[PDB]
Design a protein around this ligand. Structure first.
Ligand SMILES: [K+]
Ligand SMILES: [K+]
Ligand SMILES: [K+]
Ligand SMILES: [K+]
Ligand code: NA
Ligand SMILES: [Zn+2]
Lengths: 281, 699, 62, 61, 58
């Protein structure tokens, strides 16, 4: 007779794609290249979205009711309309929501795929909740017209973009100390990115800060310089710089610790003869 | 924005008390914070070590397994995870690691990759402290693996570290299956309470003692205890690397006969009838069975045995069945066993215990005045063992060679080339065995081996020296033994040298034909398995596949595999004759000559044996084809002599000097590999050696 | 007052090229200075030993 | 990096070199073990870069 | 390596010479120049002088 081995496991639909998603080494990086480039894509579309809008002509929920908004210092109250409402577009809605659903189905598939231990580990991890808070509100926005032009912190996907990138460099190279300072550059990029986008959006109520002005401000803040020509004048932005400072001293020293643990390793094992040099030198 | 030293200036103190307050609030900051920082950095360094803890909530659900090692290395860990997780039944299990030392630098990343990050948990801590057995949740584990440290300076003290660790884990977690790997055979009875004990010295020496009878036995038992899918080297262009890499996926599996699809129909028929017709129909080799009445396992119980509905069947197949689609020598027991728990075996014995003076070779005694194997005039070819210190482990090299089922006339004179003089405790054990001699010396010097009789020796087993195992660098352990063997490979090309390597990675240095470039090709075969994550990355090495090199890192997998297969230690120790259950067969070998060449196929060979002698062939050891005017010419001749002539002139001159006859001295273009359970359609080329499990002669 | 991370704010860049310059100047500082610091601390430990030298001018008189 | 590890023979591009110099260590405590370090290093570089001229300085005859 | 090992006699190819030495005495002092010494040897014994071990009064 003819007998084929290991058919019990591979024939199953779950176990076949278990190998594709997790077990296979080559496929894993291809999958992560899909997620990391997607997370960059949704962050870039965010930067595009804030770029082409001018709230001087009117801010509304969606459709007809849009009116110009003004800010005055004497009134100590905040107009909360511009903080939540933004006339993002029709197409940036489309491309971004495709990313939102794709990320949700991909991760919830991984949730069930890797579940072994009473699904306590998966839900608690910070990587899971971060994706929920920046995709789930963006999935329910399909249903209603007036909730299409609603602000969602989709800039936070740079953190999961960084998380995808470090899960990449763990296995393959595409040095060792260079493999960490590269990640330290990324978290500085993500830390600035949320600070720039967060201050820009929170300052839609007052000071109407541009995207570049917020970027300059966000750099002179994380460098502890703080000139004071550009400052937050309203309490949400004041809270944001406070909470943006606090995360900095709790996310950066951890990166610094592993970097200095690799600073000592950079002293030895130094040098490599490039393959391009060997062909000619 | 003040304590972060930012200080925008939109909100500032305008009146002097508040200005003083920010000044005094700043000043206290630089005097209260650095003190907290100092103790934190004093604890920053402590966070590097002692990292990890297994949460009590996880233990109730995760179904983990603990591994108490004394020092974890990259080679030892990846031989375990690639084996512990090679079974589908164990994909859920978490691996906890209780290593008292901190994580090795190269162990960091392999535990950081996403595959071995959600599975492996590392907790720095000793199993001898109950405070660290609570972290690993030893009371909740499904198995506990204690592994002895092979590369320590003290080998009898690295064994007591394991006896106490087996004791500490037994009184803290009494209801937990214990798995111990002990180093020396004398300490094997102190861990007898453990469910599964594997002894390095008892198992290793008994396999180096089978390469002399059945060649490459240490390789057959190696690919059997390594769990692999069976797809290594299928992309190879070479024909043998395709088939040999396929048949090396055969493992020993067990099943109840009635639930087996393979053996169901042969209920009530003879065991040899079921074994042959299972191989003919499906290709599985049924080596032995265990009845329900007894707990003993019998290898090839014989033709008289009749199958039953209750019996358990042990077979060799690529995967488990459920994962398949469709003077006179007196015969007696040796009186003086050197250690407690030594297995009693029916052996060939001299009628009177030989005196200690009669065992020694180099200096004769009053009874015999012979001084070398030439003077003794042995009828059969010798067996030379170049061990360092004769002990309890070496005694396990002699019992399989002297066991009763071996033919009396085929006995090979065992000669031990001990670096140190054997103690009177060891001589009392071997004084009963026939034609077992010893002589001080080493494998490096040439005179000692010539006195031993290396001219007419079939095998020279070079046992690893216990002194070199503690070498710091990997190559430094076998730097001397590889070169010393490489000297004898040139001097004696026809000799069969079996070498024990401290580290398996040193196989590349072993064969080393300088002109041949096949060593580069053998690495390409390993790179694709390295990316595929296969157990036997060393499988395609020329010395290993031929049975010439055996490291004990090959049989560490016997313990981890025993977790899913509780019979593997008994099956292995039955093949080597380490334990002898009455009615169980023994591993034999047969040479297929041209008189048997009419049996073209391996299946037809199975039919002939299972109808005449009821011997069950396991596999095939296949070999391939891979006055100034007078001395003026003496100058011209002695200058142009080839190295083969220079080496030949060296041994002959030494034999002249020591007194041995120069005659009889007067080469390996051969490739060998081990096919385990080949399909019944495989051809039987000449010079084939077929492993057998012959039934017990006293059945 | 910018490279000392003080930044009073009495003198500030008001136009975006200068704002970019201080941003890019802060970035290059954070990437060129730590490299100099690393070799300096690698030589900070060497300054503890091999300390001292007797000046040639001192030997002529002292 | 050690010449006995092929991972470090790829960095040095041993397959591309015009000559390989292995020099034994004269000032080690063991002189017959500082020679076996060189025999194995001559063996390791020979099977990784078979077409490369080898230059060995051995200590003992 | 072959030239050096030939000068020290470490290897002996048949037909190859060996490194020797001669002491210039006062009986040879009429050979003032090293060149004239080369002429005498290359016409009588065919020995090729490599160099000179010169001793002084320091
Ligand atoms: K400042
Ligand atoms: K500052
Ligand atoms: K400031
Ligand atoms: K500062
Ligand atoms: Na196998
Ligand atoms: Zn005697």
């Amino acid at each position: 007779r003819v007998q084929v081995e290991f058919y019990v496991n591979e024939n199953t639909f779950k176990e076949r794609l278990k190998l594709f998603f997790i077990k296979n080494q080559r496929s894993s990086l291809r999958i992560r290249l899909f997620n990391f480039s997607l997370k960059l894509l949704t962050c870039l579309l965010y930067i595009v979205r804030v770029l082409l809008d001018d709230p001087a002509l009117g801010i509304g929920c969606w459709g007809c009711p849009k009116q110009n908004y003004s800010f005055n210092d004497s009134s100590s109250e905040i107009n909360w309309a511009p903080i939540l409402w933004v006339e993002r577009k029709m197409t940036l809605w489309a491309i971004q929501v495709i990313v939102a659903i794709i990320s949700f189905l991909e991760t919830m598939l991984l949730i069930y795929l890797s579940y072994k231990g009473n699904i306590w580990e998966q839900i608690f991890r910070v990587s899971f909740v971060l994706e929920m808070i920046n995709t789930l509100p963006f999935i329910i926005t399909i249903f209603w017209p007036p909730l299409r032009n609603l602000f969602i912190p989709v800039f936070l996907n740079c953190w999961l973009a960084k998380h995808a990138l470090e899960n990449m460099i763990n296995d393959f190279h595409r040095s060792a100390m260079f493999n960490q300072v590269l990640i330290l550059f990324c978290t500085l990029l993500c830390l600035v990115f949320t600070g720039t986008c967060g201050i820009q959006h929170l300052e839609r109520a007052g000071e109407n800060l541009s995207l570049l002005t917020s970027f300059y401000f966000c750099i002179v803040t994380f460098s502890t310089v703080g000139y004071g020509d550009v400052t937050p004048k309203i309490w949400p932005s004041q809270l944001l710089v406070v909470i943006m400072i606090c995360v900095a001293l709790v996310v950066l020293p951890l990166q610094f610790e592993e970097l200095v643990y690799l600073w000592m390793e950079r002293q030895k094992s130094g040098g490599n003869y490039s393959r391009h040099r060997a062909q000619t030198e | 924005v003040t304590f972060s030293t930012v200080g925008y200036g939109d909100v500032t103190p305008k009146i002097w008390p508040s200005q003083l307050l920010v000044v005094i609030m700043i000043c206290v900051a630089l005097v209260v914070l650095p003190l907290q920082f100092e103790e934190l950095v004093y604890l920053w360094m402590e966070r590097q070590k002692s990292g990890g803890n297994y949460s009590r909530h996880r233990a109730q659900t995760e179904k983990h397994v603990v591994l108490c090692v004394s020092s974890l290395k990259i080679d030892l860990l990846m031989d375990f995870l690639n084996e512990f997780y090679a079974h589908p039944r164990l994909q859920d299990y978490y691996v906890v690691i209780l290593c008292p030392t901190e994580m090795d630098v190269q162990v960091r990343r392999v535990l950081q990759i996403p595959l071995w990050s959600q599975r492996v948990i590392y907790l720095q801590g000793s199993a001898l402290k109950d405070q660290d057995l609570m972290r690993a949740k030893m009371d909740n584990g499904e198995a506990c693996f204690i592994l002895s440290s092979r590369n320590e300076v003290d080998r009898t003290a690295a064994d007591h570290q394991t006896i106490l660790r087996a004791w500490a884990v037994k009184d803290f977690a009494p209801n937990c299956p214990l798995y111990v790997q002990i180093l020396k055979p004398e300490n094997k009875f102190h861990v007898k309470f453990a469910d599964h004990v594997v002894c390095e010295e008892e198992c290793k020496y008994a396999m180096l003692a089978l390469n002399c009878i059945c060649p490459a036995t240490s390789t057959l038992i190696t690919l059997l205890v390594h769990t692999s899918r069976g797809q290594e080297g299928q992309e190879s262009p070479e024909q043998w690397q395709r088939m040999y890499g396929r048949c090396s996926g055969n493992e020993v599996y067990h099943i109840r006969m009635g639930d087996s699809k393979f053996f169901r129909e042969y209920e009530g028929k003879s065991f040899t009838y079921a074994a042959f017709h299972a191989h003919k129909k499906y290709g599985v080799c049924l080596i032995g069975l265990k009845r329900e009445d007894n707990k003993s396992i019998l290898l090839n119980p014989g033709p008289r045995h009749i199958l039953a509905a209750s019996d358990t069947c042990f077979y060799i197949n690529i995967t488990k069945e459920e994962n398949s689609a469709f003077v006179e020598y007196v015969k007696g027991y040796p009186p003086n066993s050197p250690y407690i728990g030594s297995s009693p075996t029916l052996c060939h014995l001299l009628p009177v215990k030989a005196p200690f003076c009669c065992l020694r070779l180099d200096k004769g005694c009053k009874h015999n005045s012979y001084e070398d194997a030439k003077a003794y005039g042995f009828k059969n070819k010798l067996i030379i063992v170049s061990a360092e210190t004769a002990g309890n482990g070496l005694y396990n090299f002699i019992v399989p060679l002297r066991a009763y089922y071996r033919s009396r006339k085929e006995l090979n004179p065992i000669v031990l080339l001990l670096d140190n003089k054997p103690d009177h405790h060891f001589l009392e054990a071997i004084c009963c065995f026939p034609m077992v001699y010893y002589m001080e010396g080493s494998v490096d010097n040439l005179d000692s081996l010539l006195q031993c009789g290396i001219i007419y020796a079939d095998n020279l087993v070079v046992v690893d020296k216990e002194s070199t195992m503690s070498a710091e660098e990997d190559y430094m352990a076998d730097a001397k033994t590889i070169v010393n063997v490489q000297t004898m490979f040139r001097l004696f090309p026809s000799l069969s040298i079996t070498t024990e390597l401290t580290h398996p990675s040193n196989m590349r240095f072993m064969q080393f034909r300088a002109k041949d470039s096949y060593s580069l090709a053998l690495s390409k075969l390993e790179k694709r398995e390295r990316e595929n994550g296969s157990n036997l990355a060393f499988m395609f090495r020329l010395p290993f596949a031929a049975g010439r090199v055996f490291s004990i890192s090959m049989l560490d997998t016997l313990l981890y595999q025993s977790f899913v297969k509780d019979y593997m230690i008994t099956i292995t120790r039955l093949l080597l004759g380490l334990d002898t259950t009455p009615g169980s067969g023994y591993l034999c070998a047969m040479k297929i000559t041209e008189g048997d060449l009419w049996i073209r196929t391996y299946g037809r060979l199975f039919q002939k044996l299972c109808s005449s002698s009821a011997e069950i062939p396991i596999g095939i050891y296949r070999t391939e084809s891979h006055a100034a005017e007078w001395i003026s010419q003496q100058r011209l001749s002695l200058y142009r002599r080839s190295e083969r002539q220079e080496l030949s002139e060296l041994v002959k001159n030494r034999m002249k000097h020591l007194g041995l006859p120069t005659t009889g001295y007067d080469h390996q273009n051969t490739l060998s590999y081990v096919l385990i359970n080949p399909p019944p359609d495989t051809r039987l080329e000449p010079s084939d050696i077929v492993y057998l499990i012959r039934s017990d002669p006293l059945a």
